Ligand binder design. Structure first.
Ligand SMILES: [Mg+2]
Ligand SMILES: [Mg+2]
Ligand SMILES: [Mg+2]
Ligand SMILES: [Mg+2]
Ligand SMILES: [Mg+2]
Ligand SMILES: [Mg+2]
Ligand SMILES: [Mg+2]
Ligand SMILES: [Mg+2]
Ligand SMILES: [Mg+2]
Ligand SMILES: [Mg+2]
Ligand SMILES: [Mg+2]
Ligand SMILES: [Mg+2]
Ligand SMILES: [Mg+2]
Ligand SMILES: [Mg+2]
Ligand SMILES: [Mg+2]
Ligand SMILES: [Mg+2]
Ligand SMILES: [Mg+2]
Ligand SMILES: [Mg+2]
Ligand SMILES: [Mg+2]
Ligand SMILES: [Mg+2]
Ligand SMILES: [Mg+2]
Ligand SMILES: [Mg+2]
Ligand SMILES: [Mg+2]
Ligand SMILES: [Mg+2]
Ligand SMILES: [Mg+2]
Ligand SMILES: [Mg+2]
Ligand SMILES: [Mg+2]
Ligand SMILES: [Mg+2]
Ligand SMILES: [Mg+2]
Ligand SMILES: [Mg+2]
Ligand SMILES: [Mg+2]
Ligand SMILES: [Mg+2]
Ligand SMILES: [Mg+2]
Ligand SMILES: [Mg+2]
Ligand SMILES: [Mg+2]
Ligand SMILES: [Mg+2]
Ligand SMILES: [Mg+2]
Ligand SMILES: [Mg+2]
Ligand SMILES: [Mg+2]
Ligand SMILES: [Mg+2]
Ligand SMILES: [Mg+2]
Ligand SMILES: [Mg+2]
Ligand SMILES: [Mg+2]
Ligand SMILES: [Mg+2]
Ligand SMILES: [Mg+2]
Ligand SMILES: [Mg+2]
Ligand SMILES: [Mg+2]
Ligand SMILES: [Mg+2]
Ligand SMILES: [Mg+2]
Ligand SMILES: [Mg+2]
Ligand SMILES: [Mg+2]
Ligand SMILES: [Mg+2]
Ligand SMILES: [Mg+2]
Ligand SMILES: [Mg+2]
Ligand SMILES: [Mg+2]
Ligand SMILES: [Mg+2]
Ligand SMILES: [Mg+2]
Ligand SMILES: [Mg+2]
Ligand SMILES: [Mg+2]
Ligand SMILES: [Mg+2]
Ligand SMILES: [Mg+2]
Ligand SMILES: [Mg+2]
Ligand SMILES: [Zn+2]
Lengths: 62, 68, 95
RNA sequence: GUUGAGGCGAAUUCGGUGAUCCUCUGCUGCCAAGAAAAGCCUCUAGCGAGCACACACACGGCCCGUACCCCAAACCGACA
RNA sequence: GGGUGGGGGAGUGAGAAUGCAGGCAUGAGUAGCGACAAGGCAAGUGAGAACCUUGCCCGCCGAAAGACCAAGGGUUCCUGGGCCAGGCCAGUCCGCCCAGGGUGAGUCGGGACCUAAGGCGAGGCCGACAGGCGUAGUCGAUGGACAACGGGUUGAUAUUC
RNA sequence: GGAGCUGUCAACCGAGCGUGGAUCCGAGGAUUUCCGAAUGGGGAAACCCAGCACGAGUGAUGUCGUGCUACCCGCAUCUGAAUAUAUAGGGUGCGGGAGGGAACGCGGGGAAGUGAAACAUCUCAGUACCCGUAGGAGGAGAAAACAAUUGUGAUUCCGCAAGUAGUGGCGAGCGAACGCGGAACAGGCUAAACCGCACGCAUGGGUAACCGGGUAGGGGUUGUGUGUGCGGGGUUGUGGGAGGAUAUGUCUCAGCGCUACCCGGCUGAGAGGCAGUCAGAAAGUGUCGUGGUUAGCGGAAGUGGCCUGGGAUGGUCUGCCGUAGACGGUGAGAGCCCGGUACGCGAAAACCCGGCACCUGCCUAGUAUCAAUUCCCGAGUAGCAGCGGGCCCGUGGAAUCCGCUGUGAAUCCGCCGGGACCACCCGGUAAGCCUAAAUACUCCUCGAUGACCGAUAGCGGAUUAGUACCGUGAGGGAAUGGU
């Protein structure tokens, strides 16, 4: 996936430029990882697609 | 039949006028088929007085000057 | 707002086939085209105060006609062909 | 007999030949190994104080299609 | 509705683009008139008949060129009229024109019963968005189950009256 | 509104209605089949088949009428699987969404032919198209702004600056801004420190706080620290706020913070002031306008003579009107024949706009001086790096602005900008929100207009017109006015 399920960060679009300066379209996808998140400790888990910048903050608990 | 004189029929005196005007319109539709109705303006009138009793009954069940 | 069986039956069918069936107490009616046989069997028994044996029905599409503004089309009808019971009073269809 | 309608109405027995039909979703052989589901019968869970059944009479049985052409002049080919 | 004079503005001038639209010539009273079953006479009808009607004769199909459905067509069916269009001719005739009429089901063919291939698809999973696929489910006969036969009748319907 | 009427092609008849006010015109209401987002279930759109409830009908099954029954989201409630806490899920009850629309807005995705006399960078062009999403406009907007020693003081739009500085296989081409002139003008709320309170989380039991503050005592532990809420406080660049200290100030009543008092605060009301459908809180209920919109009505003046003619509205003599000599009709060029025009009059009701009331909220304790002792001023943010996008600026010495990935601060002696960068100096306070007017557009309504068209024109459509016809379809698409 390429959309965070917490902050909604999606891919940015731009260009891939070559040595002869020929420009074609690619995407800059976000770094979407899978987490099995609890809400309270001892609770059941839930699969999310969150980005690593939300993992690095305190947005989830495993 | 005037609208101002249907409003003094109570609640089911109107409902028998509707029941005996639909028999009036039913007999007129059989006289046209058998070629036996002369005043053909009479079919238009009886449809109007059926339409006029239904207005008065609906005004009573919507509060728009309800009463016997 | 309540119903009345004289809304279903529209007119009698007046033709020489329909004239021939009246001798065997068989009555033909134009009925409202979205009505079934049991409504017609209950309505005819209530209007004319008679016992009804069978009711047959047939749909008929309207004729397409030619006019200088184009083709047109007549209405489509349903007929109810009503047979009375063996030993009932004949329907006084006034003509 | 307006040659349109109507009325009357005989005998009908025994053979031969014979299917692409029937018995037969049977039978025999073969390998390439030949739908599902309702329905029907049966078992129990379950329901349960009134049922099951026969005869007789009286009833209900809805909706759409039905005319016509259809190896053609009415369908597909611009055309009878 | 125009003319002249001072000015102003132009969708302001056609013979050619194998230009575009309409009208009309030339070919020319010319080719053709759609199978190789084949018509004839008598009588009729009518203003008009090779072609319509009736009768007899002759011929052609007969695993169809006969009789039934299905798809498709849609009033072309029947009766009474009509005859300047249409039909490769004429037409009093017609699938053509006009008016009326005519299609009747517990059992026939379908739905209200069932599923196949495939379709759609609650939630779902997946995909920046648009969306892709799919579970329960729900549709989908060309198949499965399920009750009718013989006769007569109309100008036109019949396993339907 | 005021004598005729039963719409039109489009007549021909039939049968009727109307001064007891018809037809007709404007407004509010009632009815409103089936299909369609279509939503009880199904479906070849306009069809088929139910369930529940309440009525109707039948000898009773059949039958009828009116309701309700899609999915998802939100809120409130009830239950809480595997499984213990619980959660997923399920039940129930209120709300909301869905589709259509001609153009205009914002955000995202994004060509090619073409041009470069080839062609790839580049152009075309951020166009065409597409996706999401609005509104009567939208977006932007209240300086982490420019500028350059003077200063300006939110944004948007227009004219200049200027085809300039520049940029560019320095080719084809592309192309600002500072500033100047105007249109319109408007600014307001929060987060944080801390103080209260409420619910928790820990801890400590005469360590001891607490019990408004001071003070005399008392109660004898729920005090202290702390997270989540809710009010208070606070809103700034000339730095501001908090916490301090000190002066001064406290609308009135009542109650409240263990007992007494000195004092002050919290709360409930009273009085007073202010503001209001607003960006700055939000719906109403009455009542009232010289108000406005949706029907309309009145309105001056030639039956003039003669001529021509089928007909005078023409010619020629005459009489007038004009706040009216607009335009059209009428048997031929009509201010005086008709509909009107100038000018005036008009509204039950509905709608719109506004006033005044009800009503609704807000405020009544701060202020002032001094202190630098502390705390606070929006975080996975800025900055840095890699890869890209866009700026005149095509990666260049490349600032400012945006995305994705990594790394990752500081709270004023802070941080950011002033075109690499450093120093000094000037300017401004990012990572929260809202905001009118000036601008764009016209499917549609009303009123006008033309050195625009006049039936091969003007819309494809003056006429069955998106019709006939053509195509399986998406689609294409005519011809036809005049006695
Ligand atoms: Mg997702
Ligand atoms: Mg882009
Ligand atoms: Mg390119
Ligand atoms: Mg009704
Ligand atoms: Mg029968
Ligand atoms: Mg039938
Ligand atoms: Mg044998
Ligand atoms: Mg075998
Ligand atoms: Mg048949
Ligand atoms: Mg053909
Ligand atoms: Mg001339
Ligand atoms: Mg001139
Ligand atoms: Mg000139
Ligand atoms: Mg020209
Ligand atoms: Mg010419
Ligand atoms: Mg030419
Ligand atoms: Mg030509
Ligand atoms: Mg020759
Ligand atoms: Mg020849
Ligand atoms: Mg021939
Ligand atoms: Mg002869
Ligand atoms: Mg032969
Ligand atoms: Mg025939
Ligand atoms: Mg005929
Ligand atoms: Mg002829
Ligand atoms: Mg001919
Ligand atoms: Mg015809
Ligand atoms: Mg779904
Ligand atoms: Mg699917
Ligand atoms: Mg399936
Ligand atoms: Mg089915
Ligand atoms: Mg079948
Ligand atoms: Mg037949
Ligand atoms: Mg009409
Ligand atoms: Mg009136
Ligand atoms: Mg009206
Ligand atoms: Mg539906
Ligand atoms: Mg559906
Ligand atoms: Mg539990
Ligand atoms: Mg919408
Ligand atoms: Mg190119
Ligand atoms: Mg080129
Ligand atoms: Mg070239
Ligand atoms: Mg806005
Ligand atoms: Mg200025
Ligand atoms: Mg008037
Ligand atoms: Mg003359
Ligand atoms: Mg005139
Ligand atoms: Mg005039
Ligand atoms: Mg006048
Ligand atoms: Mg800040
Ligand atoms: Mg960067
Ligand atoms: Mg760039
Ligand atoms: Mg990052
Ligand atoms: Mg500098
Ligand atoms: Mg600020
Ligand atoms: Mg805003
Ligand atoms: Mg604005
Ligand atoms: Mg306008
Ligand atoms: Mg207009
Ligand atoms: Mg034209
Ligand atoms: Mg077609
Ligand atoms: Zn994230």
């Amino acid at each position: 996936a390429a959309v965070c399920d917490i902050c909604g960060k999606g891919p940015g679009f731009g260009k891939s430029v070559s040595h002869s300066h020929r420009r074609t379209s690619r995407r800059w996808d976000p770094n979407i990882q899978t987490v099995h998140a609890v809400t309270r400790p001892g609770g059941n888990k839930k699969r999310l697609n969150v980005c690593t910048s939300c993992i690095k903050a305190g947005k989830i608990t495993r | 039949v005037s609208p101002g004189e249907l409003r003094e029929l109570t609640d089911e005196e109107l409902a028998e006028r509707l029941r005996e005007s639909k028999e009036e319109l039913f007999n007129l539709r059989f006289q046209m088929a058998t070629g036996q109705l002369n005043n053909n303006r009479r079919l238009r009138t009886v449809r109007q007085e059926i339409a006029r009793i239904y207005t008065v009954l609906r005004e009573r069940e919507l509060g728009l000057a309800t009463g016997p | 707002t309540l119903a009345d069986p004289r809304d279903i039956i529209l007119a009698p069918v007046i033709s020489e086939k329909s004239y021939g069936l009246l001798d065997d107490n068989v009555y033909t009616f134009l009925v409202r085209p979205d009505s079934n046989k049991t409504q017609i069997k209950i309505a005819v028994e209530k209007i004319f105060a008679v016992k009804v044996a069978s009711v047959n029905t047939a749909n008929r599409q309207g004729k397409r006609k030619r006019t200088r503004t184009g083709y047109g089309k007549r209405k489509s009808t349903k007929r109810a062909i009503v047979t009375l019971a063996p030993g009932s009073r004949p329907i006084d269809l006034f003509g």
